[PDB]
């Protein structure tokens, strides 16, 4: 089997991407944030505290003939941005882009933090990291991908995120028309439960490539590119007037600037992030200070190849017995 679903930016900045997911019988379609940096499939629901729901579409398990309470199971998750959610668990039928899993754990939110409430476009998350990070207790649950894997033509999914445009998540096949050149594969460590890999270095604009190992995660659920302070300083030093602002919470730059590209290494291959992808616009409406899309990972504890980086590539998440990550230009 295979699946193929279009993923759409939630706003004009590509802050996140939503993908329609069918849950239950008859289908309830919710728009979920596919997150390769976490491993819970959770939804706004008929159980979510009413004051914490503001415009989201909810899953109502009582209206699904295939929903079953997973008795005694609870979940609670905290994300790197400080947001969180928690609740109980149903099993139900879940379909993504024509690919169906029966008995998927669907984590029903009883509580969500303010950032979720305030984002009316995101009806929940669909985690695609390794199932060892799943938060369901006392019986840990598998991700949608893990459950689907045995039925898939090939044990893979691909992320093809757009810049200010829709893109695609495919399951079970590699669309050879969706990228240019060849795919370069690189080793993954699952030791921390993430799609963790080591970039071979970077360049700023037309500058020389610096060969240096940068361990980080491929994380579709993080907007920006978070890298070591040394690397980030070298990038922003090439932008007149750019500076790190503790008041704003990162690097800012004059909105009048033209940003240089940023290149990262994947083995001997190179992925180029155009400068425009690094512009996240005014820090507040009407400001002439703009927020940068490359930020320091210092104090996160991990480097994160978020959407800024991933959307510059066609990315293969290979979930074979020995997992790997592939990157191609597109």
Q: Among candidates 242, 130, 243, 136, which has minimal Cα distance to 192?
A: 130
Cis peptide before 138 (omega within 30 of 0): yes
Q: Determine whether domain 5-174 maps to CATH 2.40.70.10.
A: yes
CATH number for region 175-330: 2.40.70.10
Decide if 318 contacts 37 (C-beta within 8 A): no
Of the listed 39, 86, 199, 261, which one is catalytic?
199
Cβ burial, residue 177 (10 Å; 0-12/13-18/19+): exposed
35 is catalytic: yes
197: number of Cβ within 10 Å:
21
115 is catalytic: no
Of the listed 35, 40, 123, 160, which one is catalytic?
35
The separation between CA 22 and the C-alpha centre of its own chain, rounded to angstroms, equals 19
Q: What are the tokens at 279? A: 């512009």
The separation between CA 98 and the C-alpha centre of its own chain, rounded to angstroms, equals 21
Topology alike, domains 5-174 and 175-330: yes
For this entry, resolution in Å reads 1.2
Compute the distance between CA of residue 161 and CA of residue 309 in angstroms, rounded to an integer. 10
Q: DSSP assignment, residue 224?
A: S
Domain ranges of the chain: 5-174, 175-330
């Amino acid at each position: 089997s295979t699946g193929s679903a279009t993923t759409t930016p939630i706003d004009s900045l590509d802050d996140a991407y939503i993908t329609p997911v069918q849950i239950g019988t008859p289908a309830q379609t919710l728009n979920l944030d596919f997150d390769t940096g976490s491993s819970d499939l959770w939804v706004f629901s008929s159980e979510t505290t009413a004051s914490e729901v503001d415009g989201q579409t909810i899953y109502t398990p009582s209206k699904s003939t295939t929903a079953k309470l997973l008795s005694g199971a609870t979940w609670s998750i905290s994300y790197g941005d400080g947001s969180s959610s928690s609740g109980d668990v149903y099993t139900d039928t879940v379909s993504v882009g024509g690919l169906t899993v029966t008995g998927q754990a669907v984590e029903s939110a009883k509580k969500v933090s303010s950032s979720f409430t305030e984002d009316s476009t995101i009806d929940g998350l669909l985690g695609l990291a390794f199932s060892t990070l799943n938060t369901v207790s006392p019986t840990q649950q598998k991700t949608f991908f893990d459950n689907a894997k045995a039925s898939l033509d090939s044990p893979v999914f691909t992320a093809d995120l757009g810049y200010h445009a829709p893109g695609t998540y495919n399951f079970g096949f590699i669309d050879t028309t969706a990228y240019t050149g060849s795919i370069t594969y690189t080793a993954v460590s699952t030791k921390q439960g993430f799609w963790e890999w080591t970039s071979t270095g970077y360049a700023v604009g037309s500058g020389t490539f610096k060969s240096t190992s940068i361990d980080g995660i491929a994380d579709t659920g993080t907007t920006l590119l978070y890298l070591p302070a040394t690397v980030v300083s070298a990038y922003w030093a090439q932008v007149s007037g750019a500076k790190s602002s503790s008041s704003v919470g990162g690097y800012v730059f004059p909105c009048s600037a033209t940003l240089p590209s940023f290149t990262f290494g994947v083995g001997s291959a190179r992925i180029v992030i155009p400068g425009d992808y690094i512009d996240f616009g005014p820090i507040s409406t009407g400001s002439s200070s703009c927020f940068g899309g490359i930020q320091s990972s210092a104090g996160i504890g991990i480097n994160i190849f978020g959407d800024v980086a991933l959307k510059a590539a066609f990315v293969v998440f290979n979930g074979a017995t020995t997992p790997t990550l592939g990157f191609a230009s597109k």
